[PDB]
Amino acid sequence: MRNLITLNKGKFKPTASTAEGDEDDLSFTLLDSVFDTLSDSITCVLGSTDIGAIEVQQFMKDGSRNVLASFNIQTFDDKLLSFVHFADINQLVFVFEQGDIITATYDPVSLDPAETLIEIMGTIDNGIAAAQWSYDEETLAMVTKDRNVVVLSKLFEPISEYHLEVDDLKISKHV
Amino acid sequence: SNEIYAAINKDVLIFAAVPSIEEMKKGKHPSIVCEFPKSEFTSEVDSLRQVAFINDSIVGVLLDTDNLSRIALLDIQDITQPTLITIVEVYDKIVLL
């Protein structure tokens, strides 16, 4: 038994943070999002692929569309590989394709930008393929475009790395 | 009656019937006796979500809209061609029915 049903279909559209009256569409397509378990909200992200203009907003349950950060990227065109948020330190970490490992540290009180800190912990040569934050947020892993996997702590020191190769699959099959 | 079963396909309801409980026992599985497309009773509405019955005389179809939800009532007498009862509206988001 145990049929599965739907209880709610709550949905909306994340509006952009207008700066000069350009309230219309700026091709501010959604990039990624993450559940805000510490406040029961959504930390949505909407960015532009032409200028690098990205706005990350903590969409509160009550409707407080708090734009926690907004800025531009050096490569400004490479895809946002991944994104997550840290509650204890109140950080927003983004990982882009080209190695733009960006950390945005905001203030609990003043959620306006320019009151934050934007840092680049490091870059990956010749870009990255994919990355995925650990469910405990204690480590992060990715692989370079040239098959070199790297794993590193949440303080962004390289835990280890391993050049992904072709021979290994050929030896550990046992068919 | 335990003899009519409803199913919600996207934009259509399927009503299946078995002549009697005993005929269910003997092996005659319930057969599709009626199909009522959503467009046939509402030529365009958002999407149906859940369904229930009333005394084997009425059907309540809970569908969700962008803000609220609509409970459409259907009469199962003359199963082949059911008639649309008033589509009642609740000004809140129904989660269960």
Side-chain angles (χ1 to χ4, degrees), chain B residues 69-84:
Chain B
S69 305
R70 311 291 309 240
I71 301 186
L73 314 188
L74 273 311
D75 203 319
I76 40 155
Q77 299 185 119
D78 191 77
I79 177 60
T80 169
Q81 291 287 4
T83 87
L84 176 61

Side-chain angles (χ1 to χ4, degrees), chain A residues 2-63:
Chain A
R2 314 219 77 196
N3 308 263
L4 259 196
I5 60 199
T6 300
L7 304 195
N8 182 7
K9 289 295 300 287
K11 82 158 164 297
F12 38 81
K13 197 154 201 187
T15 54
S17 158
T18 317
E20 70 281 340
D22 198 310
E23 275 279 309
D24 60 62
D25 173 33
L26 305 103
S27 299
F28 259 123
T29 168
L30 266 158
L31 287 191
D32 211 300
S33 37
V34 154
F35 266 90
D36 197 315
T37 73
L38 266 302
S39 44
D40 199 300
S41 94
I42 309 280
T43 313
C44 35
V45 176
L46 58 163
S48 56
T49 168
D50 38 14
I51 329 289
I54 57 166
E55 315 177 0
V56 306
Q57 318 171 356
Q58 175 189 326
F59 206 100
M60 289 323 267
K61 181 180 177 151
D62 59 77

